[PDB]
Design a protein around this ligand. Structure first.
Ligand SMILES: CCCCCCCCCCCCCCCCCC(=O)OC[C@H](COP(=O)([O-])OCC(O)COP(=O)([O-])OC[C@@H](COC(=O)CCCCCCCCCCCCCCCCC)OC(=O)CCCCCCCCCCCCCCCCC)OC(=O)CCCCCCCCCCCCCCCCC
Ligand SMILES: CCCCCCCCCCCCCCCCCC(=O)OC[C@H](COP(=O)([O-])OCC(O)COP(=O)([O-])OC[C@@H](COC(=O)CCCCCCCCCCCCCCCCC)OC(=O)CCCCCCCCCCCCCCCCC)OC(=O)CCCCCCCCCCCCCCCCC
Ligand SMILES: CCCCCCCCCCCCCCCCCC(=O)OC[C@H](COP(=O)([O-])OCC[N+](C)(C)C)OC(=O)CCCCCCCCCCCCCCCCC
Ligand SMILES: CCCCCCCCCCCCCCCCCC(=O)OC[C@H](COP(=O)(O)OCCN)OC(=O)CCCCCCCCCCCCCCCCC
Ligand SMILES: CCCCCCCCCCCCCCCCCC(=O)OC[C@H](COP(=O)(O)OCCN)OC(=O)CCCCCCCCCCCCCCCCC
Ligand SMILES: CCCCCCCCCCCCCCCCCC(=O)OC[C@H](COP(=O)(O)OCCN)OC(=O)CCCCCCCCCCCCCCCCC
Ligand SMILES: CCCCCCCCCCCCCCCCCC(=O)OC[C@H](COP(=O)(O)OCCN)OC(=O)CCCCCCCCCCCCCCCCC
Ligand SMILES: CCCCCCCCCCCCCCCCCC(=O)OC[C@H](COP(=O)(O)OCCN)OC(=O)CCCCCCCCCCCCCCCCC
Ligand SMILES: CCCCCCCCCCCCCCCCCC(=O)OC[C@H](COP(=O)(O)OCCN)OC(=O)CCCCCCCCCCCCCCCCC
Ligand SMILES: CCCCCCCCCCCCO[C@@H]1O[C@H](CO)[C@@H](O[C@H]2O[C@H](CO)[C@@H](O)[C@H](O)[C@H]2O)[C@H](O)[C@H]1O
Lengths: 83, 96, 347, 106, 318, 98, 98, 57, 70, 175
């Protein structure tokens, strides 16, 4: 509208500190939901190994579990090297 | 600039954490032998010291269960010099 | 107070109690008590006078001391059980501390001195919250830890509360002090039956709240806080004197009124457990409360005390106080005895 | 051990400087001179700034773990609750501000 | 060996404070078209020594104190805490390497307000106590922004370890991503240390500011040393926090030289500011904190919690 | 129990006795109330830290926060009492006797 | 809980912190994890009246892990006996232990 | 209660790896790749057995 | 002139430079010419204690390499 | 003697408590509590609670106790009676230190005392954990979990603090 724009003019003239404060806070609450790289923050936190990775007893039918760390199977960190 | 550098630091952290993981089996194997030796040594001195105490069973457990229980500091260093005990107990907390 | 802020504060008083009632963790129970105490202080202070400030201070000191003892009991319980679950306590010292802490919060004798003074020093609406809603959280905790409570301790607190409440009320002319001692006496019935059947603790609590709420509401309707100011009601609102009479007889536990029901059901449970002496002593001692309820009925409804000339001016104006739920409450306070088996919904 | 030694040394020296600051003037032997609770009255405003500092300071205690909290896998929950705390800290300020809790005029 | 290290920190601190008094008078002098001390020693280099001797052999003031124990405790606390603030600082290596060194510095500075309170209590004067309480209210108010600003910067560093701030700024000074926080941080340090234009303890609006008023006080020198040690320390902390110096493990002295220059320049800016502006009113500096810095600091804290998450730039934990 | 618990439990007991035995200043009794919380904080922290109850590590903070908030409320009441009477003496808080 | 709203709605408000053998950050175990697990599983479902009798062995071991009262009694006996013999010169510490 | 069973000192004797942590850190990545099999058997034993006495071999 | 302010600043600069230089040099003196080991977490302290045992002289900063292998 | 640092600190902890619990003038009562708080933090540090210990200094000493001393100056004391110059204050102080001294005497001599609970006097170090080699601080991990595990705790704690601001403004307005 134009009533809305006039109001934004009056505060920007009288209370620039508060206008900046509400603008910065608004970005803080909105941008994370819109950012495409937010998903990588979760992935990186899950790629950090704080605990020993306890091995599994090989019953004989876990095709997707590697037998050696350098085998192809298992989660890769290729995306992280490029990121 | 902060984003790129913090991404690289996260990659460096994973490298450091994976070096630890590679070494944990060796460190675990040593720790187990060290703990078991100290307990065996305490037991030998218990047999000597408590030889004439009436009713004493040497090496008796205080738990009903026969499951392995991690010893507490007193059980491991109970009969030892104060310097080693002090280092084992407060050395990490007091290091700078 | 800004009316919106008054609403938020009341909702926080309720939230604190609700947190106590839904928590499975001792820390959250403690937080609920802390939140409740914080929110109730303003409603006690709201009329700004030295008496309201003294009552708020006396209440704060009593409740804060109780809450520290509660936390001490929780921590001792953690040391001896390694867990936080709201349930039976695992150490007899923790049990004693928590029982005493909850007795202090309830105002049970011999931790009772604050109840008459705090009630007297605050408005009628605040006293209504203090003597009804504030009992819910401590009772809900006692309801869950009772298997670990020392039997002698809890019964001793009950007997003393019935004795002190009965004797304390005999010497009172202030309505708020009468309701405070009546609350102390009724508290002893609730805890006396708790070891045997906690469901009857809930029954007595619900009926006590309804009758107490009815009394405060009728006192608020005419802005009466003393016996002699209540003695003018016959010459202003005669119907109110009849309603006051019925409720006071009900609080006295007289058949066939509703207030007999909790006394009747508690006596039954105690006798099933071969407790004969204690219910007989409690029933007899409750005659003290009936006496100073009956004294009020004499000055309010059954005789006509002298009026004043300026009372004629009041005849020309209507009652404009809300008196919320009063018609429903007064009926429940008096005419519920035929529906006594409905107490099983509390099981 | 080192931290204890440092604290002991720092406050030991401070103590020695204080006592010699009080004794060294007595070397002069200056002449003798022979020539010289309750409210304050305290303003409520000065009490209310101290209380506001405390309540704001307690909310800061809850925010201090944020650097560690960001290492979690449940980032969406963590970020929601972090912004929730800071916003309630802002709401406390807004309430104080709009009821003239931040004024100094009598 | 460690005892040598402590003394190689304490003694130079006291000497820097002594000669900062000379630098302040000469810098303020030249900004005022004059010289400042240039008679007592060449270029006034002996002036700090003459002042120090003079103060310590001066007669103690009157009147007598209201509390002897609090009268003695306040200067001990002020100076003891001032020196303690230096022990975790990485220059580039700290005397005490704390995992929570930043939190240690926050905690110790929050205790510095007690010397103000105790010296007001021991002043035996109603008006002097009221002056102390106004000073405390100023100090604690600006502690709020320092803590929140500090928390916001650490969200880019990742820990409370002071030496981790060095690693965080290996590529770039934190002042670039965080100049709005640096601005408010720098002013808060001025207000925290009661420096102009926030030096109301030395102002004209206090009930005790009148020249002919008297109350128990002193020793002046010890309180003065404690204050100026905090000025230097805050500016050292400011440099580490926002102007991180590169550290070469094989040439640590290069870090120290570059790090010392930045701290000196920041300290000189305190003197620069004192020469340039009038003094705030007490209600106006409260308004600056509660109605300007604090709303903006809360907003920037929200931003700096969100920014690393949405950019995928969360720093490491270790 | 371990030896330290004896002293922490003594400290709580001492501050509780100090709380229940008033003198004159209402302020002196509030300090005993805060002393009680400090001993609870220490005993809670020792139990939780020694047992490695990881998620309970946050409990001492919540204790401290809620107790400080309750101490702010207590101090506010003390100031209102001091405004009415000019001192924080508890012997002036005896109107409700009648 | 008095009102078990959590179970009805299936929302975990505070159960996550009630016991030390629940899920912890980074799978850090409490020191007495095994004992608490065994006591909880023994007593599960049977009610507290039965559990106070039929899981006494598990609870006694769990309590020993928590407060180590019997372990410290046994250590004190050995240490008391040892210093008695050193006073009488009838025992000598080995090279290790020094 | 029973007697806690402990292995003899001779049963605990092995040739130790007497190198410093910096040596171990430097070799850690190759050591992790080359010695994975015996290391992972040991760690599977320790987590399954929950008893150091059961994994000494 | 303004450059007569520098001598007092130089004295300040030398005083502020000394604590940082001293700590670095004393650390290398006390840890065999190397940086003092940083142990913020139990794992790092665990390795430092192991080095103290491995050294054979009870100093964690005495490093043993492949010469100890056999 | 450094191996009994925790016990020695806890003795000082009790002595400080007897300090302000005998209730001298509020000015010195605050001093006893401040010293007790500082010693209290020291005990927590020696159990591995570095963050918890520093919270005491930052929030309890730098926050709550500053406000207590602030309020004491304005509303309570301006000058104090000499510490231990009153009959009851000194008698209470002497009584407390005698009880503490005897508890310490018997616990050290018999290595065990019994009051309500059974206490062992071997030394607090004997109960410590013998396995530590993680790459993080467990205490810090538990506190950080407030924002992931403790959503409900944050809400009620946040609500209580906000209500505290509102309530205290209500209480102090005076009308
Ligand atoms: C969420 C779900 C909805 C629940 C709502 C929760 C309450 C918030 C709304 C109330 C505030 C409001 O709307 O008006 C503000 C508004 C503020 O503006 P103001 O006029 O400028 O300020 C005047 C003063 O602040 C106040 O004016 P006053 O000083 O002249 O007197 C006010 C008086 C006037 O109210 C009356 O008309 C008299 C009747 C009130 C008592 C009846 C309540 C029910 C009794 C129990 C039976 C259960 C039903 O009302 C009160 O006493 C306030 C307390 C009412 C609750 C009493 C506690 C009852 C115990 C509940 C036990 C339940 C378990 C049983 C087992 O004032 C009012 O209108 C107050 C009266 C509100 C309506 C009646 C009471 C609320 C309805 C009962 C709710 C029962 C739930 C338990 C409540 C527990 C609270 C601790
Ligand atoms: C499940 C729900 C089933 C229960 C239905 C409850 C609906 C009752 C709502 C009545 C109401 O508006 O409350 C206003 C009421 C104000 O009126 P009041 O002071 O309670 O006295 C009645 C007035 O004369 C009434 O003043 P009025 O002249 O303004 O009456 C007009 C009012 C109609 O309001 C009425 O007719 C009041 C009579 C309704 C019954 C009173 C509630 C009883 C609730 C059941 C109690 C269960 C008893 C226990 C069971 C038996 C024992 C086992 O019109 C309406 O608002 C229709 C209700 C729209 C929904 O305030 C509140 O209830 C909320 C605060
Ligand atoms: C006195 C007047 C005011 C000055 C007091 C100064 C602060 C007290 C010392 C606390 C230091 C601290 O918390 O640093 C944590 C620091 C930093 O913690 P950290 O976790 O960063 O590092 C510890 C070491 N790692 C990381 C390897 C685990 O802790 C230490 O450095 C170790 C402390 C060792 C144990 C200390 C025992 C004595 C404690 C005494 C406390 C004060 C007594 C009371 C004095 C009177 C009242 C104030
Ligand atoms: C259901 C099973 C359970 C059974 C339990 C018993 C249920 C009864 C209890 C119900 C609750 C009490 C409400 C009873 C309604 C009372 C109605 C009434 O008494 O009239 C009021 C009357 C009107 O006065 P006024 O305002 O002037 O109006 C004039 C009318 N044209 O006011 C007056 O004129 C004043 C009267 C003078 C005072 C007389 C005092 C005696 C009153 C006797 C009735 C009270 C009964 C309560 C005790 C229970 C009895 C068993
Ligand atoms: C108002 C504007 C708020 C906008 C919020 C939009 C949220 C959109 C959303 O989807 O929430 C999750 C969000 C994005 O993640 P998403 O990709 O959607 O994952 C989907 C998996 N189900 O998850 C995220 O990435 C981060 C979510 C941050 C949202 C924070 C919102 C603030 C919450 C605190 C409110 C405080 C209010 C207190 C007021 C007190 C008043 C007394
Ligand atoms: C200034 C422009 C030149 C940039 C500069 O300062 O020189 C950088 C030099 C080494 O750069 P370095 O900081 O170690 O590496 C950066 C990676 N972290 O470092 C140095 O040369 C030593 C510092 C000398 C140059 C001064 C830089 C600091 C200036 C701070 C000014 C403070 C002003 C305060 C403003 C408020 C008062 C108005
Ligand atoms: C796209 C563009 C986005 C930006 C647009 C923002 C729109 C304007 C925002 C509101 C502007 C301020 C409104 C206002 O009228 O301010 C004036 C007034 C202060 O005037 P005052 O000095 O107190 O007057 C007294 C007489 N001398 O204000 C007041 O009296 C009360 C103001 C209280 C504000 C305190 C807020 C503290 C929190 C800072 C922000 C942090 C984020 C808060 C959470 C929001 C999340 C979205
Ligand atoms: C082995 C485990 C034991 C655990 C218990 C540990 C706590 C007890 C040890 C003492 C510790 C110090 C605590 C001191 C608190 C009591 C001091 C106090 O505040 O009393 C005030 C009151 C006098 O008040 P006032 O108005 O000043 O003077 C009137 C008297 N003419 O006081 C008086 O009237 C005189 C009383 C002074 C003597 C105090 C004796 C201690 C209090 C009795 C505790 C008994 C239970 C202990 C168990
Ligand atoms: C006014 C302030 C309003 C406070 C309520 C809204 C605040 C918005 C922020 C909270 C939204 C919920 C965020 C969330 O997603 O948490 C969900 C949480 C489970 O999260 P999860 O990821 O599964 O954690 C698993 C751990 N491994 O599951 C939960 O914990 C859900 C708990 C939500 C309860 C909120 C409603 C409680 C009602 C009392 C409100 C108290 C404040 C207002 C009181 C007014 C007076 C009564
Ligand atoms: C080994 C070192 C030993 C310590 C040596 C300490 C030497 C101290 C020398 C101080 C030199 C004079 O420095 C100057 O002193 C006066 C105090 O009179 C200060 O003056 C300031 O404080 C006083 C009050 O305290 C105010 O009245 C005055 O208006 C204000 O400007 C100046 O801000 C300062 O620049």
């Amino acid at each position: 509208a134009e009533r809305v724009a006039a109001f934004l003019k009056n505060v920007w003239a009288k209370e620039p500190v508060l206008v900046a404060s509400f603008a910065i806070a608004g970005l803080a609450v909105i941008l994370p939901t819109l950012s495409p790289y937010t998903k990588y923050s979760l992935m990186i936190n899950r790629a950090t190994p704080y605990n020993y990775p306890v091995p599994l007893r090989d019953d004989g039918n876990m095709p997707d579990v590697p037998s050696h760390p350098q085998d192809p199977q298992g989660p890769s960190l290729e995306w992280l090297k490029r990121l | 600039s902060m984003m790129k550098w913090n991404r690289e630091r996260r990659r460096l952290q994973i490298e450091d954490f994976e070096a630890r993981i590679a070494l944990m089996p060796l460190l675990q194997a040593e720790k187990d032998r060290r703990v078991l030796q100290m307990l065996r040594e305490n037991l030998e001195e218990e047999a000597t010291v408590m030889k004439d105490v009436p009713g004493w069973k040497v090496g008796e457990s205080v738990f009903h269960t026969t499951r392995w229980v991690t010893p507490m500091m007193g059980e491991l260093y109970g009969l030892r010099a104060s310097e080693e005990v002090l280092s084992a107990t407060y050395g990490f907390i007091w290091y700078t | 107070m800004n009316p919106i802020i008054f609403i938020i504060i009341l909702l926080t008083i309720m939230l604190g109690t609700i947190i106590v009632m839904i928590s499975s963790h001792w820390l959250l129970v403690w937080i609920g008590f802390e939140m409740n105490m914080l929110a109730i202080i303003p409603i006690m202070m709201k009329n700004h006078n030295p008496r309201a400030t003294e009552a708020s201070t006396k209440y704060f000191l009593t409740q804060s001391t109780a809450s520290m003892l509660l936390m001490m009991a929780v921590i001792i319980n953690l040391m001896f059980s390694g867990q936080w679950t709201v349930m039976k306590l695992f150490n007899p010292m923790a049990s004693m501390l928590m029982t005493m802490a909850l007795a202090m919060k309830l105002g049970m004798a011999p931790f009772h001195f604050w109840v008459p003074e705090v009630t007297q020093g605050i408005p009628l609406s605040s006293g209504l919250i203090l003597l009804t809603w504030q009992k819910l959280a401590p009772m809900s905790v006692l309801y869950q830890i009772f298997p670990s409570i020392n039997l002698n301790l809890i019964l001793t607190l009950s007997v003393l509360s019935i004795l002190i409440g009965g004797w304390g009320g005999l010497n009172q002319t202030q309505l708020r002090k009468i309701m405070a001692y009546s609350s102390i006496a009724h508290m002893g019935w609730m805890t006396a039956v708790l070891p045997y059947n906690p469901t009857m603790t809930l029954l007595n609590l619900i009926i006590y709240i309804i009758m107490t709420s009815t009394m405060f509401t009728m006192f608020m309707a005419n802005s009466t806080t003393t016996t002699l100011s209540l003695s003018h009601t016959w010459n202003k609102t005669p119907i109110m004197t009849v309603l006051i009479l019925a409720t006071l007889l009900s609080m006295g536990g007289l058949p066939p009124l509703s207030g007999f029901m909790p006394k009747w059901m508690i006596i039954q449970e105690m006798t099933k457990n071969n407790s004969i002496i204690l219910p007989t002593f409690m029933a007899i001692t409750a005659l003290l409360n009936l006496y100073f309820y009956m004294r009020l009925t004499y000055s309010t409804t059954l005789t006509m005390f002298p009026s004043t000339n300026n009372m004629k001016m009041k005849w020309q104006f209507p009652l404009m106080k809300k008196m919320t739920f009063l018609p429903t409450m007064v009926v429940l306070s008096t005419m519920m005895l035929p529906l006594t088996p409905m107490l099983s919904v509390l099981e | 051990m080192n931290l204890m030694l440092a604290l002991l040394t720092n406050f030991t020296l401070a103590t020695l400087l204080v006592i010699i600051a009080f004794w060294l003037p007595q070397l002069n032997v200056y002449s003798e001179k022979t020539s010289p609770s309750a409210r304050l009255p305290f303003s409520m405003k000065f009490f209310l700034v101290a209380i506001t500092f405390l309540l704001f300071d307690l909310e800061i205690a809850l925010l201090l773990p944020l650097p560690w909290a960001s290492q979690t896998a449940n980032l969406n929950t963590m970020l929601t609750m972090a912004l929730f705390l800071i916003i309630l800290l802002a709401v406390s300020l807004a309430y104080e501000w709009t009821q003239k809790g931040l004024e100094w005029t009598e | 060996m460690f005892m040598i290290n402590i003394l190689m920190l304490i003694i130079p601190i006291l000497l820097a404070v002594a000669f900062l008094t000379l630098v302040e008078r000469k810098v303020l002098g030249y900004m005022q078209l004059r010289k400042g001390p240039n008679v007592v020693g060449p270029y006034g280099l002996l002036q700090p020594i003459a002042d120090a001797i003079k103060l310590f052999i001066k007669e103690p003031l009157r009147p007598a104190t209201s509390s002897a124990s609090m009268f003695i405790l306040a200067p001990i606390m002020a100076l003891g805490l001032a020196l303690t603030m230096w022990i975790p600082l990485p220059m580039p290596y700290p005397l005490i390497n704390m995992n929570l060194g930043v939190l240690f510095m926050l905690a110790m500075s929050s205790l510095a307000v007690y010397s103000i309170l105790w010296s007001g209590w021991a002043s035996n004067s109603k008006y002097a106590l009221i002056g102390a309480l106004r000073a405390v209210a100023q100090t604690i108010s600006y502690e709020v922004t320092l803590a929140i600003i500090l928390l916001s910067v650490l969200l880019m560093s990742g820990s409370f370890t002071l030496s981790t701030l060095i690693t965080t700024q290996e590529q770039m000074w934190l002042i670039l991503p965080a100049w709005p926080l640096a601005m408010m941080w720098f002013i808060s340090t001025l207000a925290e240390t009661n420096r102009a234009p926030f030096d109301l303890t030395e102002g004209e609006s206090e009930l005790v500011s009148g020249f002919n008023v008297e109350y128990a006080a002193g020793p002046f020198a010890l309180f003065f040393m404690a204050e100026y040690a905090n000025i230097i320390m805050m500016n050292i902390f400011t440099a580490i926090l926002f102007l991180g110096t590169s550290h070469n493990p094989h040439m640590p002295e290069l870090y120290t030289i570059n790090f010392t220059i930045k701290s000196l320049l920041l300290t000189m800016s305190f003197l620069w500011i004192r020469a340039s502006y009038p003094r705030f009113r007490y209600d106006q500096l409260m308004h600056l904190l509660w109605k300007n810095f604090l709303p903006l600091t809360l907003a920037l804290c929200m931003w700096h919690v969100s920014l690393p998450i949405l950019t995928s730039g969360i720093p490491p934990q270790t | 129990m371990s030896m330290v618990y004896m002293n922490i439990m003594m400290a709580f007991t001492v501050s509780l006795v100090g709380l229940l035995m008033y003198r004159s200043h209402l302020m002196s009794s509030l300090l005993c109330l805060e002393g009680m919380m400090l001993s609870l904080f220490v005993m809670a922290a020792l139990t939780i830290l020694n047992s490695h109850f990881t998620l309970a590590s946050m409990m001492p903070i919540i204790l401290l926060v809620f107790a400080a908030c309750e101490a702010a409320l207590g101090l506010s009441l003390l100031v209102m009492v001091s405004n009415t009477y000019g001192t924080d003496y508890v012997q002036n808080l005896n109107l409700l006797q009648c | 809980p008095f009102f078990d709203v959590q179970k009805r709605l299936g929302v975990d408000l505070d159960r996550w912190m009630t016991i030390q053998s629940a899920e912890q950050p980074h799978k850090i175990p409490s020191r007495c994890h095994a004992f608490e697990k065994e006591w909880i599983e023994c007593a599960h479902g049977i009610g507290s009246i039965r559990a106070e009798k039929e899981c006494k062995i598990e609870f006694e071991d769990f309590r020993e892990c928590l407060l180590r009262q019997k372990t410290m009694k046994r250590l004190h006996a050995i240490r008391r006996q040892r210093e008695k013999l050193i006073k009488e010169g009838k025992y000598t510490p080995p090279p290790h232990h020094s | 209660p029973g007697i806690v069973e402990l292995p003899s000192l001779e049963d605990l004797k092995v040739q130790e790896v007497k190198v410093s942590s910096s040596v171990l850190k430097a070799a850690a990545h190759h050591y992790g790749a080359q010695c994975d099999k015996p290391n992972k058997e040991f760690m599977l034993c320790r987590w399954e057995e929950k008893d150091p006495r059961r994994c000494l071999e | 002139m303004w450059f007569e302010v520098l001598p007092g600043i130089a004295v300040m600069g030398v005083c502020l430079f000394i604590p940082g230089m001293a700590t670095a040099r004393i650390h290398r003196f006390s840890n065999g010419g190397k940086e003092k080991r940083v142990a913020h977490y139990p794992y790092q302290w665990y390795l430092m204690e192991r080095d103290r045992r491995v050294s054979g002289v009870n100093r964690s900063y005495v490093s043993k390499g492949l010469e100890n292998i056999d | 003697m450094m191996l009994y640092i925790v016990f020695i600190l806890s003795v000082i902890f009790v002595m400080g408590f007897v300090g302000f619990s005998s209730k001298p003038s509020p000015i010195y009562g605050g001093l006893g509590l401040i010293v007790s708080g500082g010693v209290g933090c020291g005990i927590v540090l020696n159990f591995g609670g570095s963050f918890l210990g520093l919270m005491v200094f930052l929030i309890y000493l730098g926050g709550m106790m500053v406000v207590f001393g602030y309020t004491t100056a304005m509303a309570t004391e301006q000058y104090p009676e000499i510490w231990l110059s009153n009959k009851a204050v000194l008698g209470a102080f002497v009584t407390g230190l005698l009880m503490e001294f005897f508890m310490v005497y018997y616990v050290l001599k018999d290595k065990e005392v019994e009051v309500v609970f059974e206490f062992n006097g071997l030394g607090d170090w004997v109960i410590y954990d013998t396995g530590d080699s993680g790459f993080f601080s467990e205490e810090a991990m538990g506190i950080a979990a407030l924002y992931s595990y403790g959503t409900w705790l944050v809400i009620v704690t946040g609500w209580s603090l906000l209500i505290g601001v509102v309530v205290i403004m209500e209480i102090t307005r005076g009308n």
